Amino acid sequence: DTRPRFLEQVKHECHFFNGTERVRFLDRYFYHQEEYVRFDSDVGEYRAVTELGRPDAEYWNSQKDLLEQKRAAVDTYCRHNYGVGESFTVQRRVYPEVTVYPAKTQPLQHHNLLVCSVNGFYPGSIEVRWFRNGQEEKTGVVSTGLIQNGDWTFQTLVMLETVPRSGEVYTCQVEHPSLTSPLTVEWR
Amino acid sequence: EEHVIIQAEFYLNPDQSGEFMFDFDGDEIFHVDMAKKETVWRLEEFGRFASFEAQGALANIAVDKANLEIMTKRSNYTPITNVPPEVTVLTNSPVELREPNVLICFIDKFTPPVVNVTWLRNGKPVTTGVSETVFLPREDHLFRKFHYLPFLPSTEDVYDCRVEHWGLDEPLLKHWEFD
């Protein structure tokens, strides 16, 4: 089935700053991926993105009975939904799970790659740092960044390229909004 | 501290695929199941805390379909440009023997929103326990999607995420095994 396909997208966006305080609403319309016209809350009336949207902006601005709804969206749509859902989105807090283990690999020669896996946490804001017998290991540690599991939890692996010498202890420390105090996992 | 809620919707022809959903900071809150015409919250919890009348979504989709008729004609019948997806396979959490886990197949940066994903375990396909999401919007207006698979980690099992999409001239495969 190789018949042409034609895609239509619409995105009703609500941008929040300092909470439900300073808000901005966007009414965006797309043909494939090119947005062609949109209502910018900060602008007041639909503006044409590309020339393919010239007719749509002129047509909608005419109806001031319409322009009144979109101009009230920040309060009627955005701020309203933010309140309904902040209980379980904005305030959502999920404990991270920290596991430290030796890489089931070792691409680096005779150096042992130590992995610190932080799993199932929310929100996305988190901070993972490695420690050796006291002191931080800034160099020789790269991560996967933030990974989304798609089910409202994240994971991130912060690997550490270590040079093995028995008599040392390794500590992975995590600080997250859901934590009362840093989580720490040691590896001997 | 800064957040974003997006009500994204799309319509596809000649497939007549329609989608309506809410996205808060990159995660899905719910989408409306077009065939049954009932709302589906990503997490059961969301359900008893907030509600959405499906019927209001079919309304908008019906319009997106109407506007599509218009735009197609306007763009002088310009079809979309297939964009193949980059497939990455990974696990929900650190993997440990006989300890229930989840294999995730993340399909990214693609469009149009029509893909066919399959899970293979040592050759033959597996379909028990699997689950998936609808297409998630990306800021660049392409799409994402997740497919899950529960399993008991073994030493001899090699799992395969198989993805098909018009942008790929041939089906893709993404291997994953313990080691």
Binding site: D27, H80, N81 | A50, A57, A59, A66
Partner: peptide
């Protein structure tokens, strides 16, 4: 409470 969908305006042909 419940989430309110924002309407998708129809274009003219």
């Amino acid at each position: 409470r419940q989430l309110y969908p924002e309407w998708t305006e129809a274009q003219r042909l």
